[PDB]
Structure 1
Amino acid sequence: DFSRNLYDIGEQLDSEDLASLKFLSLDYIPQRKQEPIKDALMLFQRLQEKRMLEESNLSFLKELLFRINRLDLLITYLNTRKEEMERELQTPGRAQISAYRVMLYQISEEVSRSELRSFKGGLQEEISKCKLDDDMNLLDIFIEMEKRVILGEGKLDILKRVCAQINKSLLKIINDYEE
């Protein structure tokens, strides 16, 4: 039953949703363990190995599904409404994902293709030249920035520069996260 439910939830996630989940799980699943994850069941089993996903602890899975805006999966397979998740994640202590990760994902969801071109253009001097090809999305650029300690919870200056050069709502997201 439980395994069939996890399999069915995995069958509803495409490669982009899977990339989103892997980015949201960077603070719990390291790079080496993340590399061979090509479907949702592998990430689910990696969470099971850390006991963050069991038949009596669906909290982190529900949080992951809520953060990627798959409310349909939450209501269908986990029997959870949007208001329930909103009330749960804003209670002190229950948030398992860091606000930094959520703000990075939200900024990635608000950047179109041309804005991504300009964002990649802005970072021409802080990333090696082969690692700035079209084959990367904004989350991979965020990961590569974190690897070079130019982006982080205390280092928002370069992100703020690029976003201010691009758009105002991104600066609003950054400043709303900061407070």
Structure 2
Amino acid sequence: LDFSRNLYDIGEQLDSEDLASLKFLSLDYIPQRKQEPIKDALMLFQRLQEKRMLEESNLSFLKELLFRINRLDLLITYLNTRKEEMERELQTPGRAQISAYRVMLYQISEEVSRSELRSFKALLQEEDSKCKLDDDMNLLDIFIEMEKRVILGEGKLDILKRVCAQINKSLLKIINDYEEFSKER
């Protein structure tokens, strides 16, 4: 089967939410300020090709992205890859190419409900005045804004924890599990 055609086929099944998620998960290869021209998934895939992160004989990053955005359907149809295989692969030390920090933030975004997102905005406003926040922003946009204002980063989780602890233990658990494993180092 044809590599380029397959990339297009996958791209056609990815929606605007998927694209925004994939862009977020690609941050420690495609800097935030270089993502604006990327208007669809195929364009993201072409940027990854240019970086030799994606090629005919190297599908590992594409598989990891699709797995972490939960497009198990596309992994089966277009990449003949199962959830079981990805769990085994990504649980092997060194195999994952997305940073534990970036995965951690993404996993918080997956858990947060619409009402919890309203709470996150309100609580962050109590903790910080530097961020520009509005009602239309999703949690990933909030994280990007927190990073812009240098109140969130790999070793700077204080505000994130203060907000999450007031929303749901589940979120704080994601952060604490990440922190523990990171210091294990």
Q: Shorter-chain TM-score category? A: over 0.9
Deviations along 1:94-131, whole A, 9 cap, x unmatched? Answer: 11001111110110011111111110112225666882
Partner-residue secondary structure (3-state), 1:123: helix
1:31 Cα deviation from its structure 2 partner? 2.3
- Equivalent residues of 2:131, 2:146 under 8 A apart: no
- Note closer, same or farther for the CA distance 1:101–1:114 as it changes in structure 2 (3 Å cut): same
CA deviation map 1:142-162 (0-9, x unaligned): 011112221122111111000
Deviations 1:1-55 (A, max 9, x none): 1111000000110000110000000110012320121210110000001010000
TM-score normalised by length of structure 2: 0.92
Q: Is the 8 A contact 2:66 2:72 kept in 1?
A: yes
Q: In the aligned structure 1, how far is the partner of 2:170 from the partner of 2:113?
A: 13
- CA–CA distance in structure 1, aligned partners of residues 38 and 9 of structure 2: 17
Mapping of residues 1-179 of structure 1, within 5 Å: 1-124=2-125, 131-179=132-180
Cα distance 1:126–1:35, how it changes in 2: closer, same or farther (>3 A)?
A: farther
Which stretch shifts more, 127-136 or 160-169? 127-136
TM-score (norm 1): 0.95
Pick closer, same or farther for the CA change 1:129–1:149 going to 2, 3 Å: closer
Partner Cα distance (1:48, 1:64) in 2: 14
8 Å CA contact 2:131–2:145 kept in 1: the answer is no
Distance across 1 between alignment mates of 2:137 and 2:54: 30
> Where does structure 2 lack aligned partners over 5 or more consecutive residues?
181-185
Deviates more, 1:52-61 or 1:143-152: 143-152
* Unaligned 5+ runs, structure 1: none
Distance 1:85 1:100, change over 3 A: same
Q: 1:115 to 1:33 in 2, by over 3 A?
A: same
Q: State how many pairs are aligned.
A: 179
Identity %: 98
The answer to whether the Cα contact below 8 Å between 2:53 and 2:61 also exists between their aligned partners in 1 is: yes
Moved more, 41-50 or 27-36: 27-36
